């Protein structure tokens, strides 16, 4: 405790001194205008997805979402948003096969690490499906924390 | 994040023997012993008993850093009194006193 | 068929799938809760 | 140190208290004993929680944390295999105790979930361990959480063996009073004062067990520390007298283990 | 948000005293200090665990999910 540094009782920390709970929310929207291209939510596949991220999608359900209680860490994908291949001039869909299912998913921030708390599925005033995911994790006082 | 495993406070790891005895070069009949996974809960007993032995010239210890459960013990004795054996004697002594402590408590408790 | 989500402001389960509309059949709400996974979650009590 | 030392005298005693006068001992041992009681005595406690159902207000790990702090009967903890040394996969009845918790808001009023509601599932094999310690005169051992009518909680717990060094949840000591040299005769401390330290500082209760120093006395520089006043408590998992005895046993084992190590090296030496 | 099982500074279980604590304040109508004493909370490092506890869980349970 030499400067403004301090000595904290580890046993007290163990019991629960200054322990806190942290929440973070993610979100995404269904799509824009269906001009020969639409966007949605659905679990992607390594061989049936174009420009897939370097994380994982095996924690996603049918609609690309994760049920509460599931432990999700780091680069793990939480919202399996998909957006059709756009190799053409108009930036719309295209007559391709495996790569037609181009994704546009959302994962956790690379430094995050916790479990899914709550998932909300609604629509905006434009009738567009909206996904919002809240996750949580415990913060336990470290030697770099400020008090 | 990068916090150490609490098991490392008392359980020996791979390649970690409990004790390591090195010979000092700064003085004759003197050794330095490393206690792995062991703080001065035990260490302070050892020094205390060593200093009750009139054939011991030096007995002291230090914990070089609190991040690690390690304990340095330095022992210097008079000629012929191998410091290693001096330590062995200190241990025997401590245990014998603890045995009596237990017995006296149990008796006092029963009464 | 499959419990995809549960109505908000009402314990009533919806179990609706894609294209079935987010509107709660018995409330009119548009919230929808995914509901806790079937998988058991282990915590280190430590 | 040769047996004719530690004179244990008990002033007061109860289920969770032993008030000692430990005389004829080395301060180092008095302290070492204090320390070993604080953090090197094995106990039983929930070290893993499976959440099956939780529609309560409290977070999953919030509850799990609380469960780990509930004291469990540890009388026969020495008969339970230490989990780190258990060759049996994951866990088993020989090295762990399984408890479960099932609660539902049957009433429209707030339903309280208590530690008394924990149920042991695994086979104790006749060993006196696992039973939630209940010292509440109302029978309602430790409040785990409160529960609203439409909410439900279903948990599975696995208790293991461990020591406070691993985590404070394992400690049984609670608190240990420790004092020596009631009257400042050894001059181990220099009283801070703004006028008269004899009046400014409160006289310790232990002072009645030792004759007051005289102003005509010369500093007895030959005197050593001795006669330690202690008061060991207990969280209930281990009978307060066992807390002390087992603490002593632990030190014997610790010294014996380094003695053994010395022997082992001598055996390996030429 | 419920009473901490065990005193942060001691490990002394105080998670089974909250209910009876409130009763001492209500049914018996005792001074908080004397109530804490009646609970056996001698050390101030344990007294504070109850004396300054904020029971928020009662407010949380006012919501219907
Ligand atoms: Zn509804
Ligand atoms: Zn096992
Ligand atoms: Zn306290």
């Amino acid at each position: 405790n030499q400067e403004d540094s301090m000595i904290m009782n580890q046993s007290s920390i163990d019991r629960g001194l200054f322990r806190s709970l942290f929440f973070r929310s993610y979100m995404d929207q269904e799509k824009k205008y269906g001009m020969s291209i639409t966007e949605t939510f659905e679990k992607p596949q390594r061989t049936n997805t174009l420009r897939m991220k370097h994380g994982t999608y095996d924690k996603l359900d049918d609609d690309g979402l994760i049920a509460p209680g599931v432990r999700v860490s780091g680069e793990d994908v939480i919202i399996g948003k998909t957006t059709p291949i756009s190799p053409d001039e108009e930036e719309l869909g295209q007559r391709t096969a495996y790569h037609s299912k181009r994704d546009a998913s959302t994962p956790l921030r690379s430094t995050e690490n916790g479990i899914v708390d709550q998932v909300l599925v609604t629509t905006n005033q434009d009738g567009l499906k909206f996904v919002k995911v809240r996750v949580r994790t415990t913060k336990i006082p470290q030697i770099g924390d400020k008090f | 994040m990068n916090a150490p495993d609490r098991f490392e406070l008392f359980l020996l790891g791979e390649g970690e023997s409990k004790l390591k005895i090195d010979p000092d070069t700064k003085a004759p009949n003197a050794v330095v012993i490393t206690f792995e996974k062991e703080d001065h809960t035990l260490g302070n007993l050892i020094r205390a008993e060593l200093l009750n032995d009139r054939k011991v010239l030096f007995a002291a210890y230090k914990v070089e850093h609190p991040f690690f459960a390690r304990f340095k013990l330095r022992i210097q004795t008079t000629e012929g009194y191998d410091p290693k054996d001096a330590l062995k004697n200190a241990c025997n002594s401590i245990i014998n006193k603890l045995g009596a402590l237990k017995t006296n408590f149990e008796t006092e408790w029963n009464l | 068929a499959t419990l995809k989500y549960i109505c908000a402001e009402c314990s009533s389960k919806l179990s609706l799938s894609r294209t079935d509309a987010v509107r709660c059949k018995d409330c009119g709400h548009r919230i929808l809760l995914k509901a806790r996974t079937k998988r058991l979650v282990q915590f280190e009590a430590r | 140190m040769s047996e004719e030392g530690p004179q244990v005298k008990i002033r007061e005693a109860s289920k969770d208290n032993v008030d000692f006068i430990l005389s004829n001992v080395d301060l180092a041992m008095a302290n070492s004993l204090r320390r070993v009681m604080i953090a090197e005595i094995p106990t039983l406690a929930i070290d893993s929680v499976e959440v099956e159902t939780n529609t309560t207000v409290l977070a999953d790990e919030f509850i799990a944390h609380r469960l780990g702090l509930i004291p469990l009967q540890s009388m026969d903890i020495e008969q339970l295999e230490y989990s780190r040394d258990c060759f049996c996969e994951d866990h088993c009845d020989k090295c762990s105790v399984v408890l479960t918790l099932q609660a539902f808001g049957e009433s429209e009023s707030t339903t309280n979930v208590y530690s008394k509601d924990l149920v042991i599932v695994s086979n104790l094999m006749g060993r006196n361990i696992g039973h939630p310690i209940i010292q509440d005169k109302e029978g309602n051992g430790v409040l785990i959480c409160k529960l609203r009518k439409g909410q439900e909680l279903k948990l599975t717990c696995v208790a293991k063996k461990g020591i406070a060094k691993e985590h404070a949840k394992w400690g049984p000591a609670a608190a240990i009073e420790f004092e020596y040299d009631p009257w400042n005769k050894l001059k181990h401390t220099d009283y801070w004062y703004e006028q008269d330290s004899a009046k400014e500082w409160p006289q310790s209760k232990n002072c009645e067990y030792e004759d007051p120093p005289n102003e005509g006395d010369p500093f007895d520089y030959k005197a050593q520390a001795d006669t330690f006043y202690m008061n060991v408590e207990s969280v209930g998992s281990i009978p307060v007298d066992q807390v002390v005895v087992r603490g002593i046993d632990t030190l014997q084992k610790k010294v014996a283990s380094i003695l053994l190590a010395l022997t082992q090296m001598d055996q390996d030496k030429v | 948000m419920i009473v901490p099982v065990r005193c942060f500074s001691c490990g002394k279980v105080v998670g089974d005293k909250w209910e009876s604590y409130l009763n001492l304040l209500q049914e018996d109508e005792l001074d908080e200090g004397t109530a804490l004493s009646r609970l056996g909370l001698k050390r101030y490092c344990c007294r504070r665990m109850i004396l300054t506890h904020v029971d928020l869980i009662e407010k949380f349970l006012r919501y219907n999910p």
Side-chain angles (χ1 to χ4, degrees), chain C residues 26-43:
Chain C
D26 62 0
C27 293
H29 287 303
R30 297 177 177 84
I31 300 300
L32 307 187
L33 302 179
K34 178 60 65 170
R36 185 185 293 274
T37 184
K38 292 180 181 178
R39 185 180 297 278
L40 297 177
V41 182
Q42 183 178 19
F43 293 88

Side-chain angles (χ1 to χ4, degrees), chain C:
Chain C
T2 299
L3 179 61
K4 296 300 187 182
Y5 40 73
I6 301 174
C7 179
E9 308 301 345
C10 183
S11 67
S12 176
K13 297 180 180 177
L14 296 174
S15 301
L16 301 173
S17 72
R18 63 179 62 177
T19 79
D20 292 334
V22 301
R23 181 187 61 82
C24 293
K25 181 178 178 180
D26 62 0
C27 293
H29 287 303
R30 297 177 177 84
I31 300 300
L32 307 187
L33 302 179
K34 178 60 65 170
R36 185 185 293 274
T37 184
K38 292 180 181 178
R39 185 180 297 278
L40 297 177
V41 182
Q42 183 178 19
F43 293 88
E44 185 187 1
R46 191 71 56 84

Side-chain angles (χ1 to χ4, degrees), chain D residues 97-264:
Chain D
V97 179
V98 178
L99 299 91
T100 60
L101 180 64
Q102 174 68 55
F104 184 90
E106 292 296 330
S107 171
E108 72 283 35
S109 67
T110 301
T111 297
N112 295 346
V113 179
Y114 295 102
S115 70
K116 75 175 177 64
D117 297 326
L118 294 173
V119 178
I120 299 169
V121 175
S122 66
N123 186 350
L124 295 177
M125 295 178 185
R127 294 170 293 181
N128 190 14
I129 60 173
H131 299 287
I133 300 300
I134 302 172
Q135 297 180 293
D136 184 346
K137 71 183 179 71
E138 300 298 319
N140 293 326
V142 175
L143 178 63
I144 293 169
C145 65
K146 294 179 179 175
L147 183 67
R148 182 181 170 94
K149 184 179 180 180
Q151 298 180 320
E152 186 175 1
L153 180 65
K154 184 177 180 186
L155 306 174
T156 299
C157 301
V158 179
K160 297 182 180 181
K161 182 177 179 182
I163 62 171
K165 287 184 181 290
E166 292 167 321
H167 191 283
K169 70 196 285 184
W170 298 112
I176 300 172
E177 299 182 2
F178 179 99
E179 173 170 73
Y180 70 88
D181 199 35
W183 298 100
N184 191 14
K185 293 179 183 176
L186 297 174
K187 298 187 179 293
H188 284 181
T189 188
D190 184 352
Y191 286 121
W192 181 99
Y193 65 86
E194 66 188 63
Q195 184 66 51
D196 182 353
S197 66
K199 295 179 182 178
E200 292 173 38
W201 286 91
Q203 184 176 313
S204 173
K205 68 182 181 182
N206 289 316
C207 290
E208 71 186 349
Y209 293 89
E210 182 171 348
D211 290 348
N214 299 313
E215 68 278 24
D217 293 338
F219 178 53
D220 185 355
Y221 58 85
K222 293 180 180 178
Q224 303 296 304
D226 204 355
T227 301
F228 297 83
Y229 301 89
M230 298 181 71
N231 185 338
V232 178
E233 293 185 359
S234 177
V235 303
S237 66
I238 299 175
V240 68
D241 61 297
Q242 290 299 304
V243 171
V244 175
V245 170
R246 293 175 187 200
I248 294 166
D249 284 341
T250 299
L251 287 174
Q252 290 179 30
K253 290 178 181 179
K254 288 176 69 69
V255 174
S257 70
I258 65 170
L259 180 59
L260 179 60
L262 289 168
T263 299
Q264 179 64 49

